[PDB]
C-alpha cells in the first residue's frame, strides 16, 4: 500500500540541468519529512537534500548546497528536486525517502520508506553503440585445463548493454562482467565462458551483444 | 564535518553463525544511531531506529547494542537471506542525514585457488589501432585475488583495469577479469608478455605467458 | 579566586576567521589594561595585541597589524580577539593576560595575571587517522646490549596522540618522543621501551596507540 | 626595532647553587625590565616587576639587580622547584611589550655515553610504499648529541628529522629519537643502511648498522 514512485532521470551532459520528482501513495504526504539520497556504484549512501513538513527547515549536502534546490507540492502529493549545473561527479542513483518525522530536528529515527531509485548520468558523450572483439581461447596450452573463450564489448555510451552467447543458448559456464568506464567517456565489458575443449573443434561459439539505445546488434565467432 | 567508520570491509560467515556489525563516529552526534540494510539492484531499508528500537516487520533476529560510543548490529543467527549490506547513519539534529559506507555480509567458503586464463589481444584490435589482453580468474572463494602485468619481463601498472563478479548464487565462487590496454604501436614493439596471478589458494604464484 | 578563562579555537582552514573570548572572574575588569600573547611550540613569548582601559588606545603586533583586531565589554566582563585571514605561521597557544595597570603607557608594571592558553591550529588538512608500524629489536646483534622495541604512528593530523605500551601496564623504560610536523602537514612521533632481551620471547609487547579526537584505538604487537 | 637578548641557551646548576640569569637590549627601552617563569604545560608567571620590586607570593631566593645597560636575575640559592623557562620583558612605555628569546636551567649532572640502537623498516611499511630507519639515543646527559645517517657508506642529509624529550625526572637523563625517510623506490636502490652517533661521553663515534 505504502509506496514511493521516483520519476526522471537519464543520459546528460555536464553544465546542463536535470529534474526529479516522487509521488506519494499509501500514505498522507504532508504528514512527514522528505528526503534526497544518492548511491554511485561501488559507494555506500551519500545523503543530498531534505526539506521538513510545512518547509520549516531546508538542508542541502555541501557538495550540492549552492546547485540543487528542494520543493514539495502538498496539493498534489509530490517532492521535487532541481539539480542544476550538472557534473561527471555528481553520476548516482536516486532515490526518495520518507522521513519516520516531520521535522529533521528529531534524532530518534531513521528513515522509513524508500522508493525505486533512477539513473543519473552526467557526461559529454553520445549513445554511441558498442562494438565486438572476440577473444580467441589458448586451446594450445589450456586443452587439459578446461577451454576458456571469450570477447570484449568496447566505446558504449549507455549502461544497459546486454551479452549472451548463442543467442542466450549458452548460459552455463558463462562469466559475464560489470563494465568498467574507460577514461574515454565509454564503458568496455568482458565477458567469458568455459567449456571443455573437445568441444571447440564441434561447437561454434557466437558472441551476442544487444544494445537498444543505439539499435546495435552485434554477432562475433570466437573460435582457437 | 564529522564521518562515521564501519568495519573494514567485510564479514565472513556461515548460516546459522553469529555476525557483529559496529560503527562509531570520529565525533559524538547523537544518542541513538539507525541500522539499514540493502540487497543488490534494491533501495535500502530500515531495521533499526533509537539504537534499541525494532522496526515492524523486522525479524527478532536483529538486536540493538552497543558499549561507550561503539554501536553495534548483532544478528544471533545468520539466515541465508540476511547476506546483504549494512549501513549506519546518524542525524546530528539536522536534515542532513550522515551516512557510513556500510558493511558488507559474505558467505563463508574453503579457500582454494582459480584457474588462470589468458586472451592476448584479436586482429580486429590491431587493425583498430588498439591491443587488449586478458587475465582471468575462475572460481575462486576469496574476493582479494591480485594480479599482475607483465611485459617483456618488466612490472607494469597504471594502464590496467579490474571488474569482478558479484559471490555465485550456488558455487559461492568469484571470477575476476583484469584488462591491460597497449596502442597497436606499442603492443607490436614487445616481444613477450606475461601475467603473475597471486592467491591465497595458491602454495606459490602462477605466471603465464605467450609471444 | 582570581582567574582569566579563555575560549574558542580549534582548526581552521588558511584565509579563514577564527574568534576568540576570554572571561575575567575574581578581580575588577575595567580597572585594567588587557593583552594577547601567544606561544608557538618550540619558540617563546611573543606579544600580538593590547588594550587600555576604556578602549583610551590600542595597539598591534605588526606581523597582525592589518589582520587582527581586539575589543572589549567592559560590562559583560570579557575580551574579545577577532582573528582575520589565518595562516599557518599563527598556529600557536594563545593566551589571555592582566596588566598590571590600566594605562598602557606605564614601563612599571608588568603581567601578573595569566589565563590558559587555548590552542589555535590552520592547516590545508582534514583530521586524518594515524597509521601504525611496529619497530622489531635487532635481537640478533643487541642481545647482550639489551633490547629496544619500539613503533612508529605516522601521518595523523590531530597534535594530541596518546601512546602508551600493555594498556599502561608497561610504564618502566618507555620513552615517548615528542611528534615532529611534516612537510605534507601531518605529524609523526616514535615510542621506544628497552626491556632485557631475555623476555622478548616470553612477554608479548603491544603499544596502544589512542587518537581521542577521531575515537581510533589501533593496538600494535611488536617482535623480533 | 630594538630587541632583547638573553644568554645563549642554557645554564647547569645542582640544588644549592648560585644561577645568574642576565638580559639586554640592543638600545635603551626603558628604566625597568620585568621578568617571568614559566613551566611545562603552564601559563608564564610574573616573577619581578619594575627591575627591583619582587612579585607577592614569590620566594626572597629571586632577587633583581643589574650592571651598565643590562639587567639581572640573580638566585641565591638553587632549588629543586626553581627550575623553569625564564623570560625578560620591556615595554616601550607602550602596548608593544617585547620578550627575550628565553632561557633555561638544567639539572647538573656528569657525562655518560647514550646506548644506541637502529631499527631496519617494518614490512607493513613498505608495503605502504615508504622507508623509514630510527637512530634511538638513550640516557645520555649532554644536550648536545649529534646523529648523521649513511646509506651505501654515503652521508646523507635534508631527509631526516629529529626529536628530543624533556630531562628524566629521575635518572636526569636525555632520549634522542633520529628517523631517516626514504620512499619505496629509492629504498631498495640501496644494501646497507646505517647511522654514526658523535657524543662527548664516547672516546669513538659509535656505528649501528642492518642490511
Known amino acids: 500500500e505504502v509506496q514511493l514512485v521516483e520519476s526522471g532521470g537519464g543520459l546528460v551532459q555536464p553544465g546542463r540541468s536535470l529534474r526529479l520528482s516522487c509521488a506519494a501513495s499509501?500514505?498522507?504526504?504532508?504528514?512527514?519529512?522528505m528526503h534526497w539520497v544518492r548511491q554511485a556504484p561501488g559507494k555506500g549512501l551519500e545523503w543530498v537534500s531534505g526539506?521538513?513538513?510545512?518547509?520549516?527547515?531546508?538542508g542541502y549536502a555541501d557538495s550540492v548546497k549552492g546547485r540543487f534546490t528542494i520543493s514539495r507540492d502538498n496539493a498534489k502529493n509530490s517532492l521535487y528536486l532541481q539539480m542544476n549545473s550538472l557534473r561527471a561527479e555528481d553520476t548516482a542513483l536516486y532515490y526518495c525517502?520518507?522521513?519516520?518525522?516531520?521535522?529533521?530536528?528529531?534524532?530518534?529515527?531513521?528513515?522509513?520508506?524508500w522508493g525505486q531509485g533512477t539513473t543519473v548520468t552526467v557526461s559529454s558523450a553520445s549513445t554511441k553503440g558498442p562494438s565486438v572483439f572476440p577473444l580467441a581461447p589458448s586451446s594450445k596450452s589450456t586443452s587439459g585445463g578446461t577451454a576458456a573463450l571469450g570477447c570484449l564489448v568496447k566505446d558504449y555510451f549507455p549502461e544497459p548493454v546486454t551479452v549472451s552467447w548463442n543467442s542466450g543458448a549458452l548460459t552455463s559456464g558463462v562469466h559475464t562482467f560489470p563494465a568498467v568506464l574507460q577514461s574515454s567517456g565509454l564503458y568496455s565489458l568482458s565477458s567469458v565462458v568455459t567449456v571443455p575443449s573437445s568441444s571447440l573443434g564441434t561447437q561454434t561459439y557466437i558472441c551476442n551483444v544487444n544494445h537498444k539505445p543505439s539499435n546495435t546488434k552485434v554477432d562475433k565467432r570466437v573460435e582457437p | 564535518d564529522i564521518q562515521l567508520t564501519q568495519s573494514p570491509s567485510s564479514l565472513s560467515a556461515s548460516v546459522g553463525d553469529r555476525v557483529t556489525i559496529t560503527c562509531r563516529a570520529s565525533?559524538?552526534?547523537?544518542?541513538?544511531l539507525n541500522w539499514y540494510q540493502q540487497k543488490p539492484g534494491k533501495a535500502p531499508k530500515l531495521l533499526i531506529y533509537?539504537?534499541?528500537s525494532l522496526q515492524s516487520g523486522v525479524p527478532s533476529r536483529f538486536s540493538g547494542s552497543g558499549s561507550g560510543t561503539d554501536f553495534t548490529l548483532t544478528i544471533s543467527s545468520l539466515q541465508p537471506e540476511d547476506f546483504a549490506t549494512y549501513y549506519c547513519?546518524?542525524?546530528?539534529?539536522?536534515?542532513?542525514?550522515?551516512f557510513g559506507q556500510g558493511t558488507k555480509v559474505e558467505i563463508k567458503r574453503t579457500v582454494a585457488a582459480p584457474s588462470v586464463f589468458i586472451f592476448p589481444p584479436s586482429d580486429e584490435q590491431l587493425k583498430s589501432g588498439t591491443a587488449s589482453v586478458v587475465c582471468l580468474l575462475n572460481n575462486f572463494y576469496p574476493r582479494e585475488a591480485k594480479v599482475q602485468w607483465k611485459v617483456d619481463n618488466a612490472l607494469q601498472s597504471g594502464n590496467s583495469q579490474e571488474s569482478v563478479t558479484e559471490q555465485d548464487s550456488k558455487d559461492s565462487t568469484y571470477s575476476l577479469s583484469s584488462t591491460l590496454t597497449l596502442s597497436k604501436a606499442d603492443y607490436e614493439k614487445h616481444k613477450v608478455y606475461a601475467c603473475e596471478v597471486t592467491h591465497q589458494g595458491l602454495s606459490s604464484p602462477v605466471t603465464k605467458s605467450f609471444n | 579566586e582570581v582567574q582569566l578563562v579563555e575560549s574558542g579555537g580549534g582548526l581552521v582552514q588558511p584565509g579563514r576567521s577564527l574568534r576568540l573570548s576570554c572571561?575575567?572572574?575574581?578581580?575588577?575588569?575595567?580597572?585594567?589594561?588587557?593583552?594577547?600573547v601567544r606561544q608557538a611550540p618550540g619558540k617563546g613569548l611573543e606579544w600580538?595585541?593590547?588594550?587600555?582601559?576604556?578602549?583610551?588606545?590600542?595597539?598591534?603586533?605588526d606581523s597582525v597589524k592589518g589582520r587582527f583586531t581586539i575589543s572589549r565589554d567592559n560590562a559583560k566582563n570579557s575580551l574579545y580577539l577577532q582573528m582575520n585571514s589565518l595562516r599557518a605561521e599563527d598556529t600557536a597557544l594563545?593566551?589571555?593576560?592582566?596588566?598590571?595597570?590600566?594605562?598602557?603607557?606605564?614601563?612599571?608594571?608588568?603581567?601578573?595575571?595569566?589565563?590558559?592558553g587555548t590552542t589555535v591550529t590552520v592547516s590545508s588538512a582534514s583530521t586524518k587517522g594515524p597509521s601504525v608500524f611496529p619497530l622489531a629489536p635487532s635481537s640478533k646483534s643487541t642481545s647482550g646490549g639489551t633490547a629496544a622495541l619500539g613503533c612508529l604512528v605516522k601521518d595523523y593530523f590531530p597534535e594530541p596522540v596518546t601512546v602508551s605500551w600493555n594498556s599502561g601496564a608497561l610504564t618502566s623504560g618507555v620513552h615517548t618522543f615528542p611528534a615532529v610536523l611534516q612537510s605534507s602537514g601531518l605529524y609523526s612521533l616514535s615510542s621506544v621501551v628497552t626491556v632485557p632481551s631475555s623476555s622478548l620471547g616470553t612477554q608479548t609487547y603491544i603499544c596502544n596507540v589512542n587518537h581521542k579526537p577521531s575515537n581510533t584505538k589501533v593496538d600494535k604487537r611488536v617482535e623480533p | 626595532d630594538i630587541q632583547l637578548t638573553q644568554s645563549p641557551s642554557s645554564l647547569s646548576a645542582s640544588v644549592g647553587d648560585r644561577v645568574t640569569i642576565t638580559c639586554?637590549?640592543?638600545?635603551?627601552?626603558?628604566?625597568?625590565?620585568?621578568?617571568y617563569q614559566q613551566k611545562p604545560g603552564k601559563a608564564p608567571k610574573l616573577?619581578?616587576?619594575?627591575?627591583?620590586?619582587?612579585?607577592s607570593g614569590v620566594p626572597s631566593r629571586f632577587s633583581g639587580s643589574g650592571s651598565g645597560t643590562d639587567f639581572t636575575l640573580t638566585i641565591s640559592s638553587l632549588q629543586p622547584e626553581d627550575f623553569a623557562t625564564?623570560?625578560?620583558?620591556?615595554?616601550?612605555?607602550?602596548?608593544?611589550?617585547?620578550?627575550?628569546?628565553g632561557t633555561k636551567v638544567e639539572i647538573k649532572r656528569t657525562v655518560a655515553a647514550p646506548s644506541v640502537f637502529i631499527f631496519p623498516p617494518s614490512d607493513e611499511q613498505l608495503k605502504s610504499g615508504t622507508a623509514s630507519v630510527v637512530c634511538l639515543l638513550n640516557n645520555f646527559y649532554p644536550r648536545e648529541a649529534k646523529v648523521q645517517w649513511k646509506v651505501d657508506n654515503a652521508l646523507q642529509s635534508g631527509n631526516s628529522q629529529e626529536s628530543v624529550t624533556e630531562q628524566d625526572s629521575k635518572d636526569s637523563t636525555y632520549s634522542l629519537s633520529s628517523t631517516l625517510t626514504l620512499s619505496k623506490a629509492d629504498y631498495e636502490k640501496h644494501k646497507v643502511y646505517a647511522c654514526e652517533v658523535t657524543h662527548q661521553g664516547l672516546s669513538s663515534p659509535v656505528t649501528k648498522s642492518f642490511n
Open positions: 525517502a520518507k522521513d519516520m518525522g516531520y521535522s529533521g530536528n528529531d534524532d530518534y529515527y531513521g528513515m522509513d520508506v
Open positions: 499509501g500514505f498522507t504526504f504532508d504528514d512527514y519529512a
Open positions: 526539506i521538513s513538513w510545512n518547509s520549516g527547515s531546508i
Open positions: 565525533q559524538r552526534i547523537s544518542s541513538y
Open positions: 533509537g539504537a534499541f
Open positions: 547513519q546518524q542525524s546530528y539534529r539536522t536534515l542532513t542525514r550522515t
